[PDB]
Amino acid sequence: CPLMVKVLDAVRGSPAINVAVHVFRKAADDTWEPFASGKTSESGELHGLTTEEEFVEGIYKVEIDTKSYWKALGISPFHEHAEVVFTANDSGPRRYTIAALLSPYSYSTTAVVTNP
Amino acid sequence: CPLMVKVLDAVRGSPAINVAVHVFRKAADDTWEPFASGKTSESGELHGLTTEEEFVEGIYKVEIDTKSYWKALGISPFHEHAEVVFTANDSGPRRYTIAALLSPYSYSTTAVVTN
Amino acid sequence: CPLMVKVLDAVRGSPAINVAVHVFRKAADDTWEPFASGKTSESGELHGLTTEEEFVEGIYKVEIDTKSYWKALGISPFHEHAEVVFTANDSGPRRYTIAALLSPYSYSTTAVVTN
Amino acid sequence: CPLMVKVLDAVRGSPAINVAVHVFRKAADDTWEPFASGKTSESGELHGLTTEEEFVEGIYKVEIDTKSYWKALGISPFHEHAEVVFTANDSGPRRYTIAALLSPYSYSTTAVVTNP
Ligand SMILES: O=C(O)c1cccc(/C=C/c2ccc(O)cc2)c1
Numbered sequence: 109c110p111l112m113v114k115v116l117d118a119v120r121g122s123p124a125i126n127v128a129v130h131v132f133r134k135a136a137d138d139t140w141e142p143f144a145s146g147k148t149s150e151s152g153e154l155h156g157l158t159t160e161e162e163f164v165e166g167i168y169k170v171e172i173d174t175k176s177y178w179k180a181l182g183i184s185p186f187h188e189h190a191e192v193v194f195t196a197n198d199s200g201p202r203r204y205t206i207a208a209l210l211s212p213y214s215y216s217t218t219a220v221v222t223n224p
Numbered sequence: 225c226p227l228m229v230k231v232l233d234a235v236r237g238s239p240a241i242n243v244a245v246h247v248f249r250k251a252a253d254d255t256w257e258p259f260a261s262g263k264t265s266e267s268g269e270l271h272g273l274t275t276e277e278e279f280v281e282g283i284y285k286v287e288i289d290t291k292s293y294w295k296a297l298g299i300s301p302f303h304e305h306a307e308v309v310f311t312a313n314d315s316g317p318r319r320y321t322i323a324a325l326l327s328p329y330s331y332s333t334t335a336v337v338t339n
Numbered sequence: 340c341p342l343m344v345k346v347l348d349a350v351r352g353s354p355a356i357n358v359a360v361h362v363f364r365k366a367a368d369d370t371w372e373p374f375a376s377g378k379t380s381e382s383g384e385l386h387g388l389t390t391e392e393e394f395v396e397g398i399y400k401v402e403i404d405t406k407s408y409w410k411a412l413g414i415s416p417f418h419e420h421a422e423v424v425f426t427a428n429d430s431g432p433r434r435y436t437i438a439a440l441l442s443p444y445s446y447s448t449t450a451v452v453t454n
Numbered sequence: 455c456p457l458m459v460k461v462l463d464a465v466r467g468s469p470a471i472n473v474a475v476h477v478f479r480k481a482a483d484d485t486w487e488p489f490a491s492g493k494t495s496e497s498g499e500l501h502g503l504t505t506e507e508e509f510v511e512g513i514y515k516v517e518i519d520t521k522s523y524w525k526a527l528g529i530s531p532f533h534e535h536a537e538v539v540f541t542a543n544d545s546g547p548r549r550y551t552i553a554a555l556l557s558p559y560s561y562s563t564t565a566v567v568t569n570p
């Protein structure tokens with residue numbers, strides 16, 4: 109798993125379950141091409157987005173659909189989504205975990221990057 | 225001042241000074257059109273981006289150029305930039321402060337919306 | 340104003356108003372002695388805690404009563420309070436702002452230290 | 455594992471390894487009694503602090519020794535430690551993960567609380 113996403117809910121003190129995530133990769137024409145998508149599990153984790161072969165060098169955008177998440181729980185949140193944009197694999201293959209901690213008017217995101 | 229941006233540096237414990245910030249408004253065709261921009265001041269703040277008359281309801285994106293900030297400090301960062309995307313709503317309070325707290329591999333952001 | 344405290348609410352997107360804050364200074368016997376206290380204002384800020392003359396080098400603790408804040412909003416929170424413990428250092432910049440961003444099961448805190 | 459601690463480094467984008475953690479529990483006389491201690495592993499996790507039997511109702515303080523961590527890496531940080539104080543098990547046994555994300559002048563902490 110070269111790319112994993114983990115989402116936590118700071119209101120409930122729980123994993124954020126069933127959060128939609130869309131990943132894009134910048135193409136040669138500078139547009140955002142759809143790359144992979146999925147949703148978080150009961151553990152707040154999303155695995156299996158991509159493979160070592162497919163996850164080449166590039167600029168990637170991980171869009172976490174926080175608004176849709178909060179609305180389903182009866183909260184009208186501030187943000188449309190949380191976007192995480194980064195260059196990947198520019199010094200060879202790495203494993204990336206993108207973590208996000210969500211509140212209705214705030215989020216934090218961090219990356220853990222390891223060398224296989 | 226319906227929209228203010230404040231940026232802080234979690235490594236040095238200081239305002240993040242001279243950070244480029246670009247604001248975009250989402251157009252009818254879903255593209256992002258430039259709306260306003262500037263650089264944070266010595267206090268890490270950017271005022272005067274827009275006016276009440278111009279800041280109508282709509283979807284806005286605030287892009288903070290965090291990569292350039294870290295590179296100028298000799299620090300290699302993770303993100304290309306920080307992006308804060310939100311809907312302006314007239315029902316809610318009138319003044320929006322978008323705050324961002326920056327680390328090389330992490331950022332947080334919150335909105336303080338008041339009257 | 341060598342020491343200011345600012346508290347924000349990440350659920351409502353607002354200042355955290357009327358939050359009790361207590362500051363302690365560590366004594367020679369390692370106990371925490373009361374130093375200053377107050378409640379945050381309508382802007383979520385607490386000014387006037389101390390003076391330059393009184394705020395000497397030492398270890399300080401800022402306790403923010405987050406539990407009472409959430410309970411007053413009908414929300415069950417995790418922490419008893421938020422505690423920020425730090426050393427005041429004369430070598431560094433003169434003004435300390437301790438900021439805290441509150442959620443029911445999480446808080447963040449940063450220091451903005453300036454001249 | 456009713457109590458687990460996980461620590462991440464926001465400067466390096468990595469687990470925070472070898473971070474000392476001391477847990478205290480408030481006694482009947484209102485003093486903080488030493489309860490358990492340990493340090494984070496290569497994954498930034500600390501397991502095995504306590505047991506279901508030992509981890510009774512109480513007010514607990516988890517002190518994460520962030521200053522000692524940052525100093526070893528050549529950074530003079532702001533905080534002495536990060537303290538996390540909470541009532542545990544007041545509605546029956548729960549599993550607690552205390553997570554902390556560290557920077558030299560800032561930290562964030564969150565709790566994930568699950569029912570076994
Ligand atoms: O709004 C101001 O005037 C203000 C002034 C000084 C500090 C801050 C901090 C905000 C913040 C953002 C994210 C986070 O995780 C913690 C704190 C805000």
Ligand SMILES: O=C(O)c1cccc(/C=C/c2ccc(O)cc2)c1
Nearest residue numbers: 207208209216217218553554555562
């Ligand atoms: O890496 C994991 O598996 C993991 C597991 C459980 C919790 C977390 C939390 C991360 C986090 C993110 C943002 C923040 O502000 C504080 C903590 C990460």
